[PDB]
Amino acid sequence: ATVNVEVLQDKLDHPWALAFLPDNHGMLITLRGGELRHWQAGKGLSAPLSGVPDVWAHGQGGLLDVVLAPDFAQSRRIWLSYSEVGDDGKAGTAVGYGRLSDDLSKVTDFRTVFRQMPKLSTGNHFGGRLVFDGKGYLFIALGENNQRPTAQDLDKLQGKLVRLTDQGEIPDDNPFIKESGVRAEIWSYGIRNPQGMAMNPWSNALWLNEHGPRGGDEINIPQKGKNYGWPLATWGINYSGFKIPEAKGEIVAGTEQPVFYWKDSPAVSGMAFYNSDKFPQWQQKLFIGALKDKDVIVMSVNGDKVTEDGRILTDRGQRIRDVRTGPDGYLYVLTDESSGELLKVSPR
Ligand SMILES: [Ca+2]
């Protein structure tokens, strides 16, 4: 109705993320069941690349993010996140990197450099998004594995935003490096299940989003050492309609508020800021996928504030998993379906 939509590729089995390859070489796409594939205009979709880690493809888990290292032009390094099982059948998020071959057929010498520990998931709340800040660091979004209180526990990597160096090492200036019992990898805590994350190109700061329970999805601007409240503070309720048992309220001293929340959850997903002159009407916007509402949320970004303009893609009836702004100034969208799609989207 308001946007143009081109289906670039169909029949994608639960795609989770995409990464644009430089010099018009197309893109990599993760399929959550465990396949990494290459798509390129005129060539279509490749067979699965070799060298990809085995994954625990159950519930919300599987093969999750794919992100190019900032120095990809020289290193050809690509990072992946995925769920990995432990010793009691429960799982946790894992993060590693390998080198993408020149011919795009394989990932070489993949190694896992970071693991969410303990592994507490039976299928839910892995997080998984990886974002490089472009100045030496890698941010890693971790859900609380559906064990609500653990998000507050600094000895556990549940419900945490992690910051590593861009090599996967622990930074010497991380907030809890000298805090007894605490995991040094932690940047922020008190998050439920983070989904989309992206660098705001106007503030050069990380923004993230997260699923609430029954309502209470959020956009946060996470800061060093800060508590985003979950499950002591929530804008949602339990699925029963009754309060989350651990919750003290919506606004709780010692915890940080989101910059936006929805009491009716879209089930927010991948997010992309738009800062291109290709489509000037989309300048200063943030586009957020909605899994439950089956569309994309269009928002106006105003410094550290954000407002909802409306929705696009609602008429297509597809759950939306990821949204990215391409180097060409188009929006690229992945749907969360058995017969999923890669869409190229532009305004009318
Ligand atoms: Ca919160």
Curated annotation (Swiss-Prot):
It comes from the Bacteria. Residues 192-193, 290-292, 319-321 are annotated as: PQQ. One of its GO terms (cellular component) is outer membrane-bounded periplasmic space. Binds 2 calcium ions per monomer. Ca(2+) binds at E218, Y228. The keyword ATP-binding does not apply. Keywords: Calcium, Cell outer membrane, Membrane, Metal-binding, Oxidoreductase, PQQ, Signal. GO terms for molecular function: calcium ion binding; oxidoreductase activity, acting on the CH-OH group of donors, quinone or similar compound as acceptor; pyrroloquinoline quinone binding. Its cofactor is Ca(2+); pyrroloquinoline quinone. The active site is at H125. Its EC number is 1.1.5.-. Pyrroloquinoline quinone binds at Q60, Y239. Gene3D superfamilies: TolB, C-terminal domain. Its main location: membrane. SUPFAM superfamilies: Soluble quinoprotein glucose dehydrogenase (SSF50952). Coiled coil: none annotated. It is an enzyme of class 1 (oxidoreductase). PANTHER family: ALDOSE SUGAR DEHYDROGENASE YLII, HEDGEHOG-INTERACTING PROTEIN. Aldose sugar dehydrogenase with broad substrate specificity. The physiological substrate is unknown. Can oxidize glucose to gluconolactone. Can also utilize D-arabinose, L-arabinose and 2-deoxy-glucose. Has higher activity towards oligomeric sugars, such as maltose, maltotriose or cellobiose. It may function to input sugar-derived electrons into the respiratory network. This is Aldose sugar dehydrogenase YliI.
